[PDB]
Amino acid sequence: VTQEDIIRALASPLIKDGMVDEDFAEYVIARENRSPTGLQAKGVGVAIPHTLGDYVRDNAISVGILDKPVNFSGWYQSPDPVPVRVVFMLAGRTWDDIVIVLKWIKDVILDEEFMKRLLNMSDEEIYRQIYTRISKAPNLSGINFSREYVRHL
Amino acid sequence: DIVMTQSPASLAVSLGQRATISCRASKSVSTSGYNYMHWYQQKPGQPPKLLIYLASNLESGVPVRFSGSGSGTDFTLNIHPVEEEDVATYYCQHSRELPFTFGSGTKLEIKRTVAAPSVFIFPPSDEQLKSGTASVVCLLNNFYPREAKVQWKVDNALQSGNSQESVTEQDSKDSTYSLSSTLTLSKADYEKHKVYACEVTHQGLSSPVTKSFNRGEC
Amino acid sequence: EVQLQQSGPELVKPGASVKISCKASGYTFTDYYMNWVKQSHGKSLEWIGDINPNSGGSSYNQKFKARATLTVDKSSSTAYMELRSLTSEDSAVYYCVKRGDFLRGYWYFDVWGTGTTVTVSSASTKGPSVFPLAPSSKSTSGGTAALGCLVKDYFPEPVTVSWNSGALTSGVHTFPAVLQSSGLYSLSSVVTVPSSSLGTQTYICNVNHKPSNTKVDKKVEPKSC
Ligand SMILES: *[C@@H]1O[C@H](CO)[C@@H](O[C@@H]2O[C@H](CO)[C@@H](O)[C@H](O)[C@H]2NC(C)=O)[C@H](O)[C@H]1NC(C)=O
């Protein structure tokens, strides 16, 4: 499973729910090889593949857990790939949409005990935890997160 | 962009007949199991109202007599029984890609039997005379068809060029129109003459109907 | 009930800018996208842009872009649209319309706003003169009679005409405005009532021309015999 398998498997529930165009994963792969998003989250490996957003019909997040970590390139220079265990796929219509969730995810990946729960929870327990935290946020209205956006790989 | 050729431009059906409005998209606006197509009804002088969304689904409250179909590039809006309140303009709209575009619009007018108009004439208000201009109004009320002939007569003289006509939209109940002919003339020219007539010619009248008044008599 | 109350009519000189308000009620304001659609004088609809009320993010049609600005006010649940460098081509009716689908990518429209008429010209606003169309002293001894109000020489559009503060609605026929040779608009509004009510029922037409702050109430009487 390379980055392209991970992206297309995470974009698949988005395209079926009618929130991104048909060739959505191919756009985010194109931007992944231009401005990658490998993040050495202080404990775990985290990648946030996202895109421009004119082909995005609604803001959504698709979460993917990697039991076997996969190398992702990081934007922070350093031609040393990142061992990534959690993938946060993002689709936002406008620049104003993506900036809000990006700071929210920055607070997600700087919460070790929360983050440690993701590694050893099922697709149901993960949805219950991210939904409850998205609900408590005063922003984040307009992002969609249903039970079909959690996938282990 | 996507060009949507809506057809027909005008649609004349009888009461209880079938109304079929077509909309063609220059590109396939269907992706996955989603037909991004919507229909709206705009009654005269009102904001548009939603009829159909996703090319087949009725909005909550829309009567079941409206239906939607179509897939890919050709879509159709249908009204199985056409009612008196259904006179409006219908637009199609696609949600496939940005920017959203609409059809040119389809105006639905319902056919009706001949209805003769009731004619009235109004002398200018004395409050208007102080302003230096007089306006004489002749009213044609609740008639079908829309085509009417209104002639002005001032002391038997047929006027020309000093009259403007205004026609209402088709009524949502009786399916008739109403016309107002306004004769504009100066106060000085208004009082040089006495008789002010309004001769109306219509399909519903075997002979023309004239409504007149004499300046000064009430 | 979901309601999109819009701002009042505007007269703008060419080269200037206008900002239209659109208050929303009856739903969680930040949940649904807000759109703006322009309808020209030919009654053809053109989509302007959408805005996410929660993030402020807006997407625009390319034709109107660099001139249209979409903003919201989350506290008062009000959507704003700003159009700059206006010309005569921008003289149209502008609607704020609600999305309708929550989070599904359907992107249809469920509710259209009340509408705001925007007229762009160099001419100054002028109020109308309301003159009564007195019912004929003949009429009919037991039949039907006709009366109304003549709204003459105003600019720009539009004018709202109601009868008896809205109580009288049946038989009313407010005609479309006609462009007079003087350049100004003119309107006639009529209503049919029974003859036995000319002395028992009082009839008043309520004309409102917002661009010139002209609100007139005129009682329509049968003229003195
Ligand atoms: C991600 O890439 C790194 C860097 O190429 C890989 O780490 C190297 O692994 C090889 C073989 O195991 C070692 O010989 C190198 O010394 C490693 N380089 C280091 C540690 O800097 C790593 O294996 C890759 N991970 C995956 C999952 O493919």
Numbering used by the authors:
A (entry chain C): 4 to 156
B (entry chain L): 3 to 220
C (entry chain H): 1 to 225
Can you quote the paper on this entry?
The GT10.2-WT mAb bound to an epitope adjacent to, but partially overlapping with, the MPER helix graft of the immunogen, suggesting a site of competing antibody responses. Although GT10.2-WT mAb does not sterically clash with the GT10.2-10E8-UCAH mAb, it does substantially overlap with the mature 10E8 binding mode. Crystal structures of 10E8-GT10.2 complexes showed that a wild-type mouse antibody (GT10.2-WT) isolated at day 14 p.i. bound a nearby epitope, inhibited the binding of GT10.2-10E8-UCAH mAbs in vitro and the activation of 10E8-UCAH B cells in vivo. Most naive wild-type mAbs had undetectable (>50 µM) affinity, but GT10.2-WT mAbs reached median affinities of ~20 nM at day 7 p.i., ~30-fold greater than GT10.2-10E8-UCAH at day 7 p.i. To test whether endogenous CD45.1 wild-type antibodies inhibited the binding of CD45.2 10E8-UCAH mAbs, we incubated biotinylated 10E8-GT10.2 conjugated to streptavidin beads with the GT10.2-10E8-UCAH or GT10.2-WT mAbs for which the structures were determined and used 10E8-GT10.2 conjugated to streptavidin beads as a control, followed by incubation with a fluorescently labeled GT10.2-10E8-UCAH-PE mAb. When used to compete for 10E8-GT10.2 binding, GT10.2-WT mAb substantially inhibited the binding of GT10.2-10E8-UCAH-PE mAb, indicating that GT10.2-WT mAb competed for binding on 10E8-GT10.2. To analyze the competitive effect of wild-type mAbs in vivo, we injected GT10.2-WT mAb intraperitoneally (i.p.) in CD45.1 wild-type mice and concurrently transferred CD45.2 10E8-UCAH B cells (frequency 1:104) 1 day before immunization with 10E8-GT10.2 12mer40. We found almost no GC recruitment of 10E8-UCAH CD45.2+ B cells at day 7 p.i. in mice injected with GT10.2-WT mAb (mean: 0.08%), in contrast to mice that did not receive GT10.2-WT mAbs (mean: 0.65%). These observations indicated that endogenous mouse antibodies could sterically impede the binding of 10E8-UCAH to 10E8-GT10 immunogens and outcompete the mature 10E8 bnAb binding mode during antibody maturation.
